[PDB]
Design a protein around this nucleic acid. Structure first.
Lengths: 178, 158, 187
RNA sequence: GGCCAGAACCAGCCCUACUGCAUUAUCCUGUCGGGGGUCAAAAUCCGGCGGGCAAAAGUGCAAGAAUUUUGGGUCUUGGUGAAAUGAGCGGAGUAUUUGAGCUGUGCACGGCCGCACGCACUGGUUUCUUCUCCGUGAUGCUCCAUGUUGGCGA
RNA sequence: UGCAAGGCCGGAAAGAAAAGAAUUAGAGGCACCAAGUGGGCCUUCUUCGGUAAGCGGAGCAGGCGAUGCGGAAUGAACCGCUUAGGGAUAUGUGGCGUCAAAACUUAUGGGCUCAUUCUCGAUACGUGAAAAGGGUGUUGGUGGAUAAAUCCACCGGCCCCGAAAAUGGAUGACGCUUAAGCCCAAUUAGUGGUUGCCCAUUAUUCCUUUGGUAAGGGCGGAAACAAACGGAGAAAGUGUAGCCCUUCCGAUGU
RNA sequence: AGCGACGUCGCUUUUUGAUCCUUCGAUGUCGGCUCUUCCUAACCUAGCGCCGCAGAAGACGCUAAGGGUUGGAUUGUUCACCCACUGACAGGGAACGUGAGCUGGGUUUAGACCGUCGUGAGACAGGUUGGUUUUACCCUACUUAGCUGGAAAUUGCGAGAA
């Protein structure tokens, strides 16, 4: 349905002190289902990159950033992830999708499917919608061909939940057991 | 500990620190100990006779007997269901007046000196407020957190 | 996962390629053929007045795409079969014991192979024609005519395998029945 | 009738329906440069300059009186008024909580003035919004005893 | 009239401010008499001897022993949970193809996977089974290179080879392949945010019991009152058919 | 082809250890004979790949356990050795299958002898000869042998025709 990851902007700093008054107020983008998961992955990069810790820090605001109107776009998502086999591989991939979240949350599902990495080992380096001529991969390069058309073959048509009808009389729609 | 001797477990607890070696300084001979006073029992290793047992090193108690070269200290040693209150006899080279009681006896003075200061005012210094209460922040510089492509080649050295 | 993959032919005149289910009936100047492709999943289309045959795989990965270009190969062979034809010339190589072959209309025997007497014998289906090139012209040839190459190339192999040399070293004892050439009947 | 059934009402309990305050900008929408493609355009995309409310968002919080003439359940509780404490039952009347605009000093914001998105103090408007007020000790120490409709029971 | 000590007499006492600046199902303390036990075993983490052990030996703790109940098909010890007798609602661990309660096989979710005689895979603890090494099976990625697209090196995912035991046999069985398998994710689906469903001796609540370190109230008979054609109790009390009533907590056990 | 050192990764439970969980009010404790069955790491038999495979003989490997796998001298032996046949004389499991199936040569008693050890009674995982092998009629299994109900698997009247 809608993506499972909200897109947060988290802004925070170290609490001011006589050693460091006016800290430097870092900004950060996360894709996380909650704002506590966004607020947690913020203080992860703060102690990992900046040495500041959550008990010594302040959070200035956690608000989400809303997504642009829906159009088909080509997003460029560059992701890393941790394995212990390979020790931090880094990836850049494209995704057809209508929103940043809808692309990034789709990238978590592919890393989890193809590479079996689960959201905590993953960190998204960047995401942007890119113009059309920069799509390298012939698999996503095919969807912006104009006059693109395909039929729907090998479908599975589930009737309305009210109509399920376990035993349906043959070559007719009449339901003998519903 | 194989032999369960008197000073059986210690090549370290009883060793002097690196480049702190020496016999006990004057300042610890010119300290005087009044009965009732709190004390640290820390055994100096450069005086043979009079050491406390291995257990008492690092404890604190109330001095009670005071003898010309000795002291005595009341230390709480927890035993099976209860705390016995042990009386040990030490040569005072191993004894240092504890600062444990201090910040409290300073809270008591800074109350009374506070109180005589209100008696006829002169007013009083202002009451410091919380750092956790509200506020608007006016950032002088703002930066971006991100994980950099370059951050990974730093974590694989070499 | 590409959405569309194409494969197309060019059909000569005198040929009519028919498709209803996945089944292909091509009718040339001589005989007809058929293949049952129902085991594949492809969109088969014959465009008359553009005179072409096209194969489409929608949303395939590398596995179903491979099928897409082997159907053109089978349909090309149904064409070149039903017009030009297929004729394989098959020989008999012997160092010492001459291989004695004899053909009743559909029936083949092989005698004195490696000096054996077990009379190896074959029956060729009615849809493939067997004959011997008459002996003072070239040696031992046997000719398999037929429309269907899928079928003709079988007997050329079936008859090859009857003559395998069982125990004694193969790269030494070369006696066998081998294929010289594979050519069309007329064209 | 101390038995079996239904149906109404009452207290309690459970459940379900009913929604507001903030928030948005890495956004909205013009336009001009690119840029891109196509037979030719538009679009995806970067930048400049205007304007702004995507009026709705799977944003954060939610207190919205379920007989206040109508939501369900209780064969999961007890009752038929044998002290019904009730906004709910009875009596008589038309009250001040919010939202709207603004007062003055203050705070708060911007670099004394300007701002004030409407915070704190006095507490102005009545346009919207809503019911308000006062009534029964036990002279009852305890337990038990009081409906309606049919079936069966002579 | 300095310092030690026992006092005496006055002084003050946020009864401990402010600064994040404690919390408590916190009655403290003492004593007499006495039982059983003094073979333990298992586990996270630390840990020594041993090639290892369902082996031997310890540390800090938690359990079984002594204890079921719900769950992992089964198991002392794992997971959830802690047991007075019952009802409702809700849940935990674990689950929703049938066995078997729940998706009458949920979605208007994304990928990946085909496995030919111990039969691909699918409950952690449970090696209660597999390694080195391999694969132009397929699906991704990183680096470099030549230009209609292609080529070289390396690194993953699932799957395959490596993979041989004696009764017929085991994802628990059937079976599943547009999964009823693996990774990830959701709750009736860009349509408005905000709890899909099933099952515990658990939680919440209602009724009944029993015991308290139990808490509280009444107990000076208020007055009136025949049958015939509103009744009956009311005890100054550890324990009874409990003096009566209202309330609160606990309740398993070798 | 066939091998493969220095290293290295595993498997098996037909060796011996290690441990001591079950059994001490008792699980009959070596080997042979008999008899059945299972496993495959295949000796012969079937089909095949490959070779330093010309043929003959054979090496190595693959599917495969349906069938087959001996007659004796010496030894209580298992193991071992030699003779002889054969297409081959493969390796094993089943409570180291198999004692209410047998046998009792061995071990493991009481008698007795020798050697070594001990002052001695006596010991020896050294040698020697002699030394009781008990019960089924019960339940199941199995092998044959009879009787006999029964579809709502005894009932419902509950009804389905290859």
């Amino acid at each position: 349905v809608k993506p499972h990851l909200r897109h947060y902007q988290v802004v925070g700093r170290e609490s001011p002190s006589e050693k460091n008054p006016e800290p430097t107020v870092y900004k950060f983008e996360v894709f996380a289902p909650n704002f506590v998961v966004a607020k947690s992955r913020f203080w992860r990069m703060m102690r990992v990159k900046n040495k500041v810790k959550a008990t010594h820090g302040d959070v200035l605001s956690c608000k989400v950033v809303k997504d642009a109107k829906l159009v088909a776009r080509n997003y460029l998502v560059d992701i890393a992830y941790y394995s212990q086999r390979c020790g931090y591989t880094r990836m850049v991939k494209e995704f057809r999708d209508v929103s940043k979240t809808g692309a990034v949350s789709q990238a978590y599902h592919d890393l989890a499917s193809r590479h079996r990495a689960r959201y905590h080992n993953i960190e998204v380096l960047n995401v942007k919608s890119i113009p059309d001529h920069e799509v390298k991969h012939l698999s996503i390069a095919q969807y912006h061909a104009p006059n693109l058309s395909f039929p729907l073959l090998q479908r599975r048509l589930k009737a309305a939940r009210k109509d399920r009808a376990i035993f349906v009389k043959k070559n007719t729609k009449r339901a003998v057991v519903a | 500990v194989h032999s369960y001797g008197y000073k059986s477990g210690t090549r370290h607890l009883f060793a002097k620190k690196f480049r702190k070696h020496g016999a006990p300084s004057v300042s610890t001979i010119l300290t005087n100990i009044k009965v009732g006073d709190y004390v640290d029992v820390v055994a100096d290793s450069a005086v043979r006779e009079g050491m406390p047992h291995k257990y008492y090193h690092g404890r604190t108690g109330i001095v009670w007997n005071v003898t010309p070269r000795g002291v005595g200290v009341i230390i709480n040693k927890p035993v099976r269901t209860r705390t016995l209150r042990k009386r040990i006899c030490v040569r005072f080279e191993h004894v240092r007046k504890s600062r444990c009681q201090e910040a409290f006896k300073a809270k008591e003075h800074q109350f009374q000196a506070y109180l005589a200061a209100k008696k006829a005012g002169k007013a009083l210094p202002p009451l410091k407020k919380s750092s956790r209460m509200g506020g608007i922040v006016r950032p002088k510089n703002v930066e971006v957190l991100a994980r950099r492509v370059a951050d990974y080649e730093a974590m694989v050295p070499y | 996962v590409k959405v569309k993959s194409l494969c197309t032919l060019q059909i000569p005149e005198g040929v009519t390629v028919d498709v209803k289910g996945r089944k292909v009936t091509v009718t040339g100047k001589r005989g007809t053929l058929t293949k049952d492709l129902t085991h594949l999943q492809l969109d088969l289309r014959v465009d008359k007045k553009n005179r072409t045959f096209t194969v489409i795989r929608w949303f395939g990965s590398k596995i179903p795409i491979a099928c897409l270009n082997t159907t053109k190969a089978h349909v090309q062979n149904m064409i070149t079969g039903v017009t030009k034809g297929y004729r394989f010339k098959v020989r008999c190589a012997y160092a010492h014991f001459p291989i004695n072959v004899s053909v009743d209309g559909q029936n083949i025997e092989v005698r004195n192979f490696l000096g054996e007497k077990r009379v190896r014998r074959q029956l060729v289906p009615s849809s493939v024609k067997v004959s011997q090139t008459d002996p003072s012209k070239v040696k031992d040839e046997i000719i398999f005519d037929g429309n269907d190459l899928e079928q003709v190339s079988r007997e050329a192999a079936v008859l090859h395998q009857m003559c395998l040399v069982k125990k004694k070293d193969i790269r030494k004892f070369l006696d066998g029945i081998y294929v010289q050439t594979k050519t069309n009947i007329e064209g």
